[PDB]
Amino acid sequence: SNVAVNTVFASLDNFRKGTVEIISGEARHYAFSNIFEVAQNSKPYEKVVVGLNLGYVVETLRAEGQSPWFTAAHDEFAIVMDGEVRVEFLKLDAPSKHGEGTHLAGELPVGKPMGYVLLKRGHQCLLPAGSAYRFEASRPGVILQQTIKGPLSVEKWAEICLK
């Protein structure tokens, strides 16, 4: 009778955190959070570390309004998990050549405009090394960023993970 297919995606307005059922040991060990709960309880564009592996990070961003210009010396990536983000790209005249992690590019980065991308849920874009990039969000959304722990990365495990 029911032949509908429903691929369940979550959002800031509607999410249901999973569960860690302990038989033996500690829920702590699983660093268990949910990117929607996380974005729901964070400031716009606060880069909240939700995954950390040997200095590599997965950050959750609450996309609301307009972010600061960001830049890094290596490639980064962004996945829009909810909402709709516009991403502006500048090709810096003087790119960061060394170092790791996303850095503040400044109020008025110096470089040619490359254009922009319009990301809806489920969409991914490259954040090319040596570019500055800026996030635009009319409505609250969620951005997953793949990058490296840096000056802007916020850790608050005890706040976000099961215990």
Partner 1 sequence: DDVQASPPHAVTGYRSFQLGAFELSRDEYFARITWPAKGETRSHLIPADIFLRAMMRDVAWGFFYGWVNFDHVIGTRNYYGKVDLYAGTFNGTLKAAGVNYTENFETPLIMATFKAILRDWTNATFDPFAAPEETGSAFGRKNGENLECIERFRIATKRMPGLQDDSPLRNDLPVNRQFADVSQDEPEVHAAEGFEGELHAFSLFKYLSRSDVTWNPSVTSVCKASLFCPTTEEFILPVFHGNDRVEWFIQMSDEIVWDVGDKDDGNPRARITMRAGDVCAMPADIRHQGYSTKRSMLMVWENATPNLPHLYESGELKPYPIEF
Buried-exposed string 112-127: b where 16+ CB fall within 10 A, e elsewhere: eeeeebebeeeeebeb
Per DSSP, the three-state class of 12 is: coil
- Least distance in angstroms from the C-beta of 1 to partner 1: 5
Task: List, in order, residues 6 or more apart from 37 with CB less than 8 Å away.
Answer: 15, 17, 160
Q: Which is nearer to partner 1, 23 or 108 (CB)?
A: 23
Residue ranges in 75-114 that form contacts with partner 1 under rule CB under 8 A: 75-77, 79, 81, 89, 91, 112-114
- Count of chain residues binding partner 1 (CB under 8 A): 71
Closest residue by Cα to residue 113 from 132, 88, 90, 86: 90
Residue ranges in 124-153 that form contacts with partner 1 under rule CB under 8 A: 124-126, 128, 144, 146-148
Residue ranges in 4-23 that form contacts with partner 1 under rule CB under 8 A: 4-10, 15-23
Which amino acid is located at 117 in the chain?
V
Neighbours of 12 (CB within 10 A): 20
Query: Which of residues 25, 94, 97, 108 is near partner 1 by CB under 8 A?
Result: 25
Q: Tell me if 128 sits within 8 A of 92, measured CB to CB.
A: no
- Least distance in angstroms from the C-beta of 121 to partner 1: 7
Q: Which is nearer to partner 1, 14 or 151 (CB)?
A: 14
Q: Could you tell me which stretch among 61-69, 70-78, 103-111 binds partner 1 (CB under 8 A)?
A: 70-78
Residue ranges in 36-65 that form contacts with partner 1 under rule CB under 8 A: 36-37, 50-54, 56, 58
